[PDB]
Enzyme design. Structure first.
Site, short mmCIF file in Angstrom:
data_model
loop_
_atom_site.label_atom_id
_atom_site.label_comp_id
_atom_site.label_asym_id
_atom_site.label_seq_id
_atom_site.Cartn_x
_atom_site.Cartn_y
_atom_site.Cartn_z
N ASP A 178 19.13 -15.22 -10.66
CA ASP A 178 20.20 -14.55 -9.94
C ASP A 178 19.76 -13.14 -9.55
OD1 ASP A 178 22.72 -14.07 -8.99
OD2 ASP A 178 23.28 -12.92 -10.77
N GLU A 236 34.02 -4.70 -6.43
CA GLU A 236 35.38 -4.21 -6.31
C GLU A 236 35.57 -2.83 -6.92
OE1 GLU A 236 38.09 -7.27 -7.57
OE2 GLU A 236 38.14 -7.90 -5.43
N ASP A 250 24.36 -14.11 -14.80
CA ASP A 250 25.41 -13.31 -15.41
C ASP A 250 26.82 -13.68 -15.00
OD1 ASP A 250 25.49 -10.26 -13.39
OD2 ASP A 250 25.41 -12.24 -12.64
N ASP A 309 26.66 -18.87 -11.59
CA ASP A 309 25.40 -19.26 -12.21
C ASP A 309 25.52 -20.30 -13.33
OD1 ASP A 309 24.00 -17.35 -10.67
OD2 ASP A 309 24.25 -15.75 -12.12
#
Ligand SMILES: Nc1ncnc2c1ncn2[C@@H]1O[C@H](COP(=O)(O)OP(=O)(O)CP(=O)(O)O)[C@@H](O)[C@H]1O
Ligand SMILES: [Ca+2]
Ligand SMILES: [Ca+2]
Ligand SMILES: [K+]
Ligand SMILES: [Mg+2]
EC number: 7.2.2.10
Length: 994
Positions: free
Chosen positions: A351, A442, A703, A707
């Site tokens: 990732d 965010e 994480d 994933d």
């Protein structure tokens, strides 16, 4: 305490005297601790009973030696053996090696658990509550939560306590409660009461249980129970071991020991058969039973000798050691096989966001539209200072600090960032830092809006706590958030349906505020906002907007970009169906483009390095991400996955380009490409599956929940300590550090555990082959016995114990991380190594028979029998087939026998010195690379001197040997075993294969 899930939302609030949106007062929290204690299981305690570990007898080969000691205790009980007390020693020459290895095993296991329990308890688990002392949600230690406070949970999170659901902030809420209910697929929840007090957990569809994971959505609830009163709290002590069978390599070596039990059994029955023609001999009076039992003892003793009794422990030990070393690097192992398996990994899929990068996000650039006129489009761009989440920094245009409120385009930009957002900020008073609540992308938006402060709110006179959300709250008062269309990775955007706030004017227009991946969002825009104005989207405008995105994403800051739009005229709520997430995209159409934000997200320090080490170790690294292909390629370059100027045309792919390919070509793309982007969770899984179809060992690092599927699929799943509980759940390893280097370290360790297992086997086989070569090279070449039952048991105790276990503490080979990975289905024992087991086993069997001979033949204190053995043993009683009837019994002299026992011990301790490394020389890999080995050798030599020179002992075993010149001989014959392996290592080196 709350008995009910059958009481309504209101009733639960009333029971605890709590305001839904504010939470408990400081005084309420004080009361609730006292009355309910802390939210934790006291438990913590007792993994394995001191005894339990002791009982790592039960193993394959150790039970054999256990039985082997019974016959000795029964054969001794009947007055004999052959020499009276020498039979009560036998049982304890066998137990000793067992007890020695058991002690080392128990020790390493205890240390391992301690180390792991230290790492697991290090970083405190956190929760999110609303409490009266703060307006915005705050983070506390999960331990500090009590029945009654309002808790917030969202996708990724582990549920921190037993919670009665008050309000679902997304269109659905899906939960993974396998850990409690066995239920394998996530399950839907609601906030309606469930009448049945009787009802089973699976029917508690309005509750969230501590220890489960939120799979989708965001909700708000009130805590019913905590600590031991937890639904999972009640049931802990109990379960028939949801604990498990052993590791592949363990099952391999086990299997190898199993078929070694065959070959040894056979050779043992063979000793008993090749003889017992020496049954009636004068030694045991010639009885038609006594000699049979003696040679039966030669068999058994030869068995205990040849059997690697410490194989089952050395592995158990190397495992517990690998764990303990991982824990010291802050890696938690959740599944024993992880280290070995990673040992022979050829591909690490990774990732990007949060894994290869820090996930410490920071909006540092943004733009809106400035002018549109024919095929001319211009942008008002801006920069932003402050890299941290702290609401401190400035908005610059042309290097001058501006008042964002000046630009109406920024007003709406900030409005969207504030409303369309399920995250927030919280100031840590102890650490003194602004920390995210929710997702980084965010929270960066949150902190941005506090820096833009577009309505000029007065914030200078606020505490650091209040300042954290102040401008965002101002915006929230401007508009009522009716509901939200939660982010989803197919559309790659998120929505929020809003109306103006006081209801003052109840039809000036509802709005939807949208943010997302720029490409998808910009395509669903038909208008471009210019200040307060709106004009059609056109080609040249779109091209402008996109080219600056390309610029920011590919330049040296490698910015992660997001587009922000509004839907000026939304559909009516009644036309909108919230049930099927697949309609959300249509609802987010006909949009007006407002602007774009560009985020900084630095790569972790240790990455570029770790990747080089992978290359060298022949391990491929593949980036896999939802993010834009532009920014991903640029990062891969900055990391070293790609060079700064490689054509990447066919080694980087979007989900869409990858799907456009035929299956055959997809699989092939997975073998050359190192960057996969704008790809969904299902794609991450599929790429890993493709790699696995080349029968390769694949690791996945990540994480987020995007994933988990890939993490489950890969051989080793490695989760970040900073990432989600659901990523952690699906993983075999966790990096609490977030330190990517550890993955490479774990590779080296798994490689090394393997290599250590090898040398241990090489040491035992090649040595214990000599021990057998000996007995057979005498009984065939026609000589007197070189050894007795107890003397066999002695070389065992002293060659097969700690000097063997110690190899498990061998240091890593010098090149261990410079050859490619091993194939997992490789022959345990190579064809060439089997020849080396014999070449060594041969010199040992011949150097020990040739030693007992030298005593008889060429030795000054020995009789001078001279060459040809004088041709037989026949002599027997007084002067026989008269062939120099000079000396009578000299056979049965301890001298020849304790000569051999000393070459055997000495020579075995010699090729243990070559068992430091497979093909490395003692010149480059000295003996002092393993001290644990050297100390064990001393303990052996030392024990072997003791037996020789402490007077009661030499009787029980059999008389000593002239210190000065006999040892000079033992050491003259034994030492060359080193010189031989060293030429044999020269072969396998300066000629090579593997
Ligand atoms: N909360 C959110 N709201 C709107 N859009 C979001 C969002 N989170 C991410 N996105 C956008 O959706 C895209 C797809 O998200 P996804 O989770 O699949 O990839 P990612 O880039 O967020 C993480 P990773 O790099 O770890 O794959 C992102 O690249 C970003 O453009
Ligand atoms: Ca043995
Ligand atoms: Ca041995
Ligand atoms: K896995
Ligand atoms: Mg991520």
């Amino acid at each position: 305490m709350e008995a009910a899930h059958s009481k309504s939302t209101e009733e639960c609030l009333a029971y605890f005297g709590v305001s839904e949106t504010t939470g408990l007062t400081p005084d309420q929290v004080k009361r609730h601790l006292e009355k309910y204690g802390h939210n934790e299981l006291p438990a913590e305690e007792g993994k394995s009973l001191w005894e339990l570990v002791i009982e790592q007898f039960e193993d394959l080969l150790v039970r054999i030696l256990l039985l082997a000691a019974c016959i000795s205790f029964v054969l001794a009980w009947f007055e004999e053996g052959e020499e009276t007390i020498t039979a009560f020693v036998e049982p304890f020459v066998i137990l000793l090696i067992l007890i020695a290895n058991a002690i080392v095993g128990v020790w390493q296991e205890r240390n391992a658990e301690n180390a792991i329990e230290a790492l697991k308890e290090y970083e405190p688990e956190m929760g999110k509550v609303y409490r009266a002392d703060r307006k915005s949600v705050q983070r506390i230690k999960a331990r500090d939560i009590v029945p009654g406070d309002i808790v917030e949970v969202a996708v990724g999170d582990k549920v921190p306590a037993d919670i009665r659901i008050l309000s679902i902030k997304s269109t659905t809420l899906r939960v993974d409660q396998s850990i409690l209910t066995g239920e394998s697929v996530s399950v839907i929840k609601h906030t309606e009461p469930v009448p049945d007090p009787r009802a089973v957990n699976q029917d508690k569809k309005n509750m969230l249980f501590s220890g489960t994971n939120i799979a989708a959505g965001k909700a708000l609830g009130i805590v019913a129970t905590t600590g031991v009163s937890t639904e999972i709290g009640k049931i802990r002590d109990q379960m028939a071991a949801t604990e498990q069978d052993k590791t592949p390599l363990q099952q391999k070596l086990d299997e190898f020991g199993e078929q070694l039990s065959k070959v040894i059994s056979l050779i043992c029955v063979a000793v008993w058969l090749i003889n017992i023609g020496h049954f009636n001999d004068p030694v045991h009076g010639g009885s038609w039973i006594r000699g049979a039992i003696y040679y039966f003892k030669i068999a058994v003793a030869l068995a205990v000798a040849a059997i690697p009794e410490g194989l089952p422990a050395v592995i158990t030990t190397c495992l517990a050691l690998g764990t303990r070393r991982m824990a010291k690097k802050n890696a938690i192992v959740r599944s024993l096989p992880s280290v070995e398996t990673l040992g022979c990994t050829s591909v690490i899929c990774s990732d990007k966001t949060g894994t290869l990068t820090t996930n410490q996000m920071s909006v540092c650039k943004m733009f809106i539209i400035d002018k549109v006129d024919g095929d001319f489009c211009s942008l008002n761009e801006f920069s932003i200072t402050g890299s941290t989440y702290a609401p401190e920094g400035e908005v610059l245009k042309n290097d001058k600090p501006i008042r964002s409120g000046q630009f109406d385009g920024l007003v709406e930009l900030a409005t969207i960032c504030a409303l369309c957002n399920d995250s927030s900020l919280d100031f840590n008073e102890t650490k003194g830092v602004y920390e995210k609540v929710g997702e980084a992308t965010e929270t960066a938006l949150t902190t941005l809006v506090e820096k833009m402060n577009v309505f000029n709110t007065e914030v200078r006179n606020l505490s650091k706590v209040e300042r954290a959300n102040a401008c965002n709250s101002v915006i929230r008062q401007l508009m009522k958030k009716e509901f939200t269309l939660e982010f989803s990775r197919d559309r790659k955007s998120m929505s929020v349906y809003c109306s103006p706030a006081k209801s003052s004017r109840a039809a000036v227009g509802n709005k939807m505020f949208v943010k997302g991946a720029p490409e998808g969002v910009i395509d669903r825009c038909n208008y471009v906002r210019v200040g307060t104005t709106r004009v059609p989207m056109t080609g040249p405008v779109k091209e402008k907007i996109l080219s600056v995105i390309k610029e920011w994403g590919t330049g040296r800051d490698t910015l992660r970009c997001l587009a922000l739009a509004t839907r000026d005229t939304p559909p009516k709520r009644e036309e909108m169906v919230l049930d099927d997430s697949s309609r959300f995209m249509e609802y987010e159409t006909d949009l007006t483009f407002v602007g774009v934000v560009g985020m900084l997200d630095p790569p972790r320090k240790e990455v570029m390095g770790s990747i080089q080490l992978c290359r060298d170790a022949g391990i491929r690294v593949i980036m896999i991400t939802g993010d834009n292909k532009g920014t991903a390629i640029a990062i891969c370059r900055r990391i070293g996955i790609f060079g700064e100027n490689e054509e990447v045309a066919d080694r980087a792919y979007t989900g869409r380009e990858f799907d456009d390919l035929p299956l055959a070509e997809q699989r092939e793309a997975c073998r050359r490409a190192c960057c996969f982007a704008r790809v969904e969770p299902s794609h991450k899984s599929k790429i890993v599956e493709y790699l696995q179809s080349y029968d390769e060992i694949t690791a996945m690092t990540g994480d987020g929940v995007n994933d988990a599927p890939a993490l489950k699929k890969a051989e080793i799943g490695i989760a970040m300590g900073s990432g989600t509980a659901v990523a952690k759940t699906a993983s075999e390893m966790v990096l609490a550090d977030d330190n990517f280097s550890t993955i490479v370290a774990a590779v080296e360790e798994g490689r090394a555990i393997y290599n250590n297992m090898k040398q241990f086997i090489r040491y035992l086989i090649s040595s214990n082959v000599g021990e057998v070569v000996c007995i057979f090279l005498t009984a065939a070449l026609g000589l007197p016995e070189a050894l007795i039952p107890v003397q066999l048991l002695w070389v065992n105790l002293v060659t097969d114990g700690l000097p063997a276990t110690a190899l498990g503490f061998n240091p890593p080979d010098l090149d261990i991380m410079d050859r490619p990975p091993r194939s997992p289905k490789e022959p345990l024992i190579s064809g060439w190594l089997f020849f080396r087991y014999m070449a060594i086993g041969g010199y040992v069997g011949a150097a020990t028979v040739g030693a007992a001979a030298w005593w008889f033949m060429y030795a000054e204190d020995g009789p001078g029998v001279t060459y040809h053995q004088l041709t037989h043993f026949m002599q027997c009683t007084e002067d026989h087939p008269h062939f120099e009837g000079l000396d009578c019994e000299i056979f049965e002299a301890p001298e020849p026998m304790t000569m051999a026992l000393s070459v055997l011990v000495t020579i075995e301790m010699c090729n243990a010195l070559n068992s430091l490394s497979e093909n490395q020389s003692l010149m480059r890999m000295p003996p002092w690379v393993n001290i644990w080995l050297l100390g064990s050798i001393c303990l052996s030599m030392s024990l072997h001197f003791l037996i020789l020179y402490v007077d009661p002992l030499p009787m029980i075993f059999k008389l000593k040997a002239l210190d000065l010149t006999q040892w000079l001989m033992v050491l003259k014959i034994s030492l060359p075993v080193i010189g031989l392996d060293e030429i044999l290592k020269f072969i396998a080196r300066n000629y090579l294969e593997g």
